[PDB]
Each structure stands twice: as C-alpha cells, then as structure tokens.
Amino acid sequence: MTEIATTSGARSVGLLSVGAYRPERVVTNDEICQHIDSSDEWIYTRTGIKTRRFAADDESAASMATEACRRALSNAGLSAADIDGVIVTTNTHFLQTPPAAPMVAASLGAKGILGFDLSAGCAGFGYALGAAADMIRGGGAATMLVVGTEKLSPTIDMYDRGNCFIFADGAAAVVVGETPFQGIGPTVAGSDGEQADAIRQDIDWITFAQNPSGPRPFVRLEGPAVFRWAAFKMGDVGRRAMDAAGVRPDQIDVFVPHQANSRINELLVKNLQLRPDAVVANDIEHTGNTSAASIPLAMAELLTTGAAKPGDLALLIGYGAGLSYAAQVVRMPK
Template sequence: MAARLAQVEGAEHTAMLGLGVYRPARVVTNDEVAGPIDSSDEWIRTRSGIKTRRFASDAETIVEMSAAAGRDALAAAGITADQVNCVIVATSTWLLLTPAAAPQVATQLGMNHPAAFDISAGCAGFCHAIAVASDLVKGGTAKYALVVGVERLTDAVNPTDRGTAFLFADGAGAVVIGPSDEPGIGPTVWGSDGTQHRAIRQDKDWMEFFNEIDAKGADAVRPYLAMEGTAVFRWAAHSLKTVCLDAIASAGLTPGDIDAMVPHQANGRIIEIMARELKLPQDTALANDIEHTGNTSAASIPLAMEALLRSGETKPGTDALLVAFGAGLSYAAQVVKLPNWQ
C-alpha cells in the first residue's frame, strides 16, 4: 500500500496585518502633461478627476519603490522580514521578461530566501495577489506573505497619446497577509473577459518591434500602452455592480454593512457611478485618491487605502470593499478588514 502523504494545516482565517506605500517625490500637474497632448487642466479634471499625479525618477525603480512600501508594511504589521515566506509582486511595468522583480524585492528587504514571484493582471493585479496570498496562508504553504502592487507607468505611456498620457502615474503599495483570529479577507470574486483584450493593451509585441528595428533602424517606434477609453468606461460602469454585490454577499454582508469602498482609481466618473449603483450608505467612506495620484494600475488599491486611512474618514479594522479591473480584461473584488498602516 502506498504511504499516505503528510498534509500541512494552515490558518483558519487571514487578514491584511499591515500596509505601507511609496509615492514618488515628483508631483506633476495637469498643466505639465497637457501641452504634448494639446489639452488643458480643465479638460483633464472634467474627464478623469485628476489634479496631480506622481512620476518616478530614475532612482525610484520598481524594486526600490516596492522595498520601501514593503518595509513600512512589515513595520505596521509588527512582522520581521525573516518571518515572510512568500513575496508576490503585482505589476505590468517590470520591463524584463525574466527574471521576476519579486526575488530582488525580497533580497532588498533582507528576507530569508522566501518564495517570490510576479503576477500580471493589469490594474486588478493587487486584488488577485491578495486572493493568492490569503489562500497560501490558509493552505499552510506560507505563514506570512508580502503582497506588493507597483508600477512605473511613465515607462510605458507615450507622452503624446491624448488617451493615456494624462491618466497614468507611478507608485507602490504593500500589505502583509497572515493568520487572524477572525475573518479579515472575504472570498474573492474574480474573473476575466478575453473578448475585451484589446481595450487595454501593449500596442505591439516585442517581436514586431524587433522586426521594425531590422527594417527601419532608428525610425522604429517602441511599444506603448494603448487604451480604448470608451470601451473600458462602458464595461466597468455596467459590469462591475454584480461583481461587487457578489463579493459583499460572499462575505456574508449586505451593502449597508460596508464601511468603506476602495475601488481601483481608474477614473473619477467610474468611481462615482460604482458607488451610486451599489446604493451604499451615505456615510460610507469612498476612496478618491485618483485626484492627487492618478491611475497607478496595480498600485492603485493600496495607495487609495492609505490615503483613505490617512484622511481619517475610516480606520483600521473596518469593513471595506476592494474592487479592481484592468487589462485582460481582468477583474477582482473582496471585502476586507482595513489594515494597520504606516
């Protein structure tokens, strides 16, 4: 008879134990980005809700920003680096096919050789990584996991593209996920719609670019991020209500129980529509960090969580709905207890 394999038991419940963020030093106004796209501060504010955003310097790399956010998340959680068993970095702007950024982030933080890998789910990447990390802790594969959402979208955006240049920005946010005495991360409702894959995309693949270099030399145009803004707006405005309601119900709650909502900071108008469609209570705290941070894709949710906590509109331990959507199209939502922050 074959021997029976031993099983590892994990935590019954998980929670986000600590939050840290990194915002690049350089603040960029609408006037600065408006010139190359023949736009204006008023046009940008009206269509996106953005007033300023942050652009990273050459020294503020994916690894450096991730490590800075991760360091503060560990401190807020009261966890040391050598206790972390897994690092997950959610990003779409790590411009190497291999190796991943996560092992370098772990080393930068002085960790003791944890598992470390990147995931790419566009702007929904952070919520995807939360789901994976929570399940790893519940399954016993890790006791503590560090999840980072980080982007340098200024590396991927054409500054003369009227559809994207004013929207996207840079930054990083991180949370420590570990065992909890009570449920702190509800079931994740997630999915994808590949029929909408062209809505947010890289406008050419790397082989196409290499072939252009061979044919055109210095006249070849590098790949950039492209977006069909109207298609994304319609999809998000009309498709995410069910995802959000399913996430709330899966957590055993009703919309009236939600203390805060932290949606992906894609567009100010989308945020308003989502809150209205869900009929959340009037006193529900609504993250609107896009006004000063822009759209930072996978970094958007943790940065918005920190801004909401810092404002005093909500506090650690309250029930918050996280929801994000992006390239793929991919989407994810979960109800969480907001973490301690630093």
C-alpha cells in the first residue's frame, strides 16, 4: 500500500542547436574509382554523391562525437555543466565494451552524467532524439545531448562495386531541452527484420576471431532491395510522422530524409506532396552516406548555407540497416 512516486519534466521540448564536424580529408569519386570499374559521372547520377570525407587513423566514432558535442553546446550557448545525459548513436564504435557515451561525457568535462549507446542502423538518430524527448518530458533530465557519429571507412571493401562509393565519416550532435513552443513531434518508428541482411556486416566478429587469417568482415549492401523498400515505404512513414504532429504535407518547410541515395530522396519528395518550394536536404553531395550522423549533419549544412532558418518546420525520416526507420516532425535548431 505504498505507490511508487512518479516524476515529471517539461511539456515542450525542442532542438536548441546542432553541431557538426567533418574530418578534413576530402575523398573524391576519381580517387574512389581507383580500384573500381566506374566513373565520377556514373557515381554522381546513380547516387548524387560527388565527394565525401574520410577520418584520420587516430580518429574514432567517439572522438568525433566528442567534437560534435562541443560545437553544439557552443551553438546552444551552453556548458557541459548544463547537460544531464548523452546518447551516442553509432554503428561503428569498434568495441563491444565500454560504450562510447561515457568516454564522450568524460572528455566533454562532465564525467558523471547519464548516457548510453543506441544502435539501430541509419535510423539511429530518430530513436535517440525520440528517447531524449521522452526522457526530458519524463523528468529524468532537463537538457540532453544526442549525437550521431560514424566511422565507416575501415569497414568499406574498396573492391566492392556496389557500395564502396557510398559510406563515409562525420559526427553531428544536437542539444535537446525545454522550449517555449512545442518543437519535436511524436516519434514514428518500426522496422522490417525480415530484410536484416540487406545491409549487414557479412561475417560476425567472433567467427572472424576464430580464423583471423581468413577473410575479414566488410559492410555489404543489397542496393536494389534497399532502393525499393525506402522509395516505396517511407512515404507513409513521413505521412504518419506529419499526422502525429498535427501538421500537413504542405506545411513542411525543410525535408531531411536520410542521405542514403538522392534518387530515393527525389521519389520521396514527390510522394510526400510537399510544397514546390520545400527545401530538401542534399548533404549527400559532399558528405556521402554517414548513417546515424546523416540527418543531423544534413540539418547543420542547410542552417550553415542559410537555405534553412532556425525554427523552420521540418520532417525527419531515418532509414537503413536492420531494416528499421524512425521519423519525427521538428523545428530547425541553431
């Protein structure tokens, strides 16, 4: 006869700021075409990618994540002392343990703060932004870091005619906290674990670890399957996300799909019936596919180029590995 107490946070939460960090090494298509039988033009028309960034040998998903946070914090007018938790979303923290979240908190100056690694393929940001919003409104935190980071280079098979020109590096973090107006709509999510092997690590670490001198694992992609699924299934995912926020297709100002493939995104923009003048993220051009980091990296780009304004109503749609998606309507940060 003693009811467990419940706590409560803020009603309205929003993206206070975005920070982005891309490693300085520019990898061209022609440099990629080195061990590939295709050209710059073939790669740009089929994907929309021109150049992408590769990290340094000493760099890691965590170090870039630490770096993205600082910048977001700086853009937020906030210190590490003002943060209550940090979620790292990544698919390329190359340790089973420890998780990257503590390390990032540690180097940021706030070693004691709550946090975890959330891994859900390319869709990892939608879930982690979703988890923050709910935790903050829940009262477990007031202000929170959600960082997407990905070191994909070391996982690329440079002879792989189907995916080498695709994956890249970068880290972008957002600051989530209380806001006057409601800023982040309901998370709309789900998956398709039937197609789990569409984007995968071909060999598992333990099997590989039993015969290290045999073929090592790489990232593999059954592209047409991914094209079909994404191109035809995310339209509703976007509609469900807009519906839960109480908004209309013609009300979206910025559209931030996962930067997987520009032809896919072209089909979604048309399927989503947005305004003819809706600003549509195209960070694919000089960032490539950065999985968990893709969307917040895309957001920053548009804010930096001034194509998007802070406070613009925006739709987010994450899609990729596991075959799992996540989508939310948000105001633009910064």
